[PDB]
């Protein structure tokens with residue numbers, strides 16, 4: 116007779132709020148996803164999952180924008196679907212990141228089958244030491260393992276890489292990323308999203324100065340969806356009598372080239 | 373009478389009142405130096421500075437900061453050889469570097485925005501200039517066609533599109549630079565009844581997800597994301613054209629940079 120709040124308690128004790136729904140509802144199935152899109156909510160209904168665990172918020176902000184969205188028709192139609200669906204939606208974000216090895220990062224490393232190459236887990240990043248690959252080869256490897264349509268790369272595509280730093284989510288900014296390059300003697304960094312005018316411009320200059328360095332930018336959702344698939348596997352083991360599944364979304368962007 | 377660096381600064385900041393703790397400052401050089409040449413750029417990259425020196429332009433006017441932040445970092449400027457070698461180049465360059473950002477955006481028509489609209493040859497289609505956006509009413513194109521048009525007119529290798537590539541687009545909002553976030557973009561979509569928005573850069577979890585859901589709900593809307601430099605370089609090219617008019621004896625050149633990213637597909 117596991118309830119919504121029972122699941123939240125197990126998640127909160129492995130180491131973020133119930134955006135909607137009855138915490139005392141009995142859980143009949145669980146979906147996980149990076150983003151609680153309108154279509155993911157419809158898919159949860161079709162799967163008869165009445166608890167959706169997602170990484171991001173419901174209404175396109177990390178802050179509470181409910182008042183600014185009250186007159187918005189997209190918000191109104193989404194809240195109408197949520198009320199009709201009877202689903203509960205829980206945002207699981209900070210806890211998973213703050214675990215000893217960050218669970219989002221662990222999921223990413225596992226998706227790339229790089230468990231055996233991890234040199235160290237840092238609070239904000241992980242470091243891997245791999246057999247030599249060019250930066251373009253690392254970019255192609257990540258694209259293939261993650262099954263994503265495109266990646267972006269700054270700097271030297273031919274840079275020989277044996278030490279790589281990984282930062283998931285919106286962690287590509289210069290304050291987190293730039294110090295790692297010489298502190299951990301990195302050839303390249305992989306990250307999800309960050310300001311275009313910070314770490315990529317550092318790499319542009321470094322390559323201009325002759326350094327063989329590069330930056331592989333995956334996409335924010337692309338960098339964190341392995342963590343949410345990993346979460347569904349963990350939840351399915353924690354609750355073996357409740358069906359639990361990851362829902363993947365389509366890429367947010369298409370490239371016009 | 374010759375023209376000095378501070379002379380150019382004053383001509384640039386002339387019609388805009390003083391902005392409190394703006395970082396539109398002189399990053400390096402002597403304000404009383406005479407200007408033999410002027411270069412404009414979006415970003416003061418290592419190569420941009422080398423080219424300005426090589427062209428004997430001794431005043432570089434750029435939109436962004438010198439060390440990979442909107443706030444330069446003395447901590448980690450000390451270590452890291454990349455920062456060090458760039459500082460060494462600047463010092464031995466003997467050129468003046470002035471960051472023209474807020475005052476450019478706060479010109480009566482946003483100078484970055486006017487440069488962008490000129491580069492797309494869309495001045496005839498402007499419906500209004502808002503403080504932090506422009507609205508254009510264009511001959512009907514699909515969203516994909518708008519994206520392809522922007523890519524061709526700006527001479528850039530790729531653009532990205534969220535939403536409905538089939539969306540019939542006539543009313544388009546434009547936000548240059550890092551203004552694509554939902555605080556600015558989402559109100560505009562329903563206040564100004566936009567079919568699409570073109571912007572430089574913004575959080576992937578804000579406006580693109582709004583449009584994803586809009587399209588899931590049956591709306592025919594799209595988002596075209598150009599890149600930060602791609603959205604603001606035309607504004608610095610236009611600044612070079614303007615500055616040459618204002619200082620006719622001084623050679624003025626716009627220094628374009630490479631795309632920051634290559635796409636692997």
Ligand SMILES: [Zn+2]
Nearest residue numbers: 170219284339
């Ligand atoms: Zn995250």
Ligand SMILES: [Zn+2]
Nearest residue numbers: 435484549604
């Ligand atoms: Zn700008």
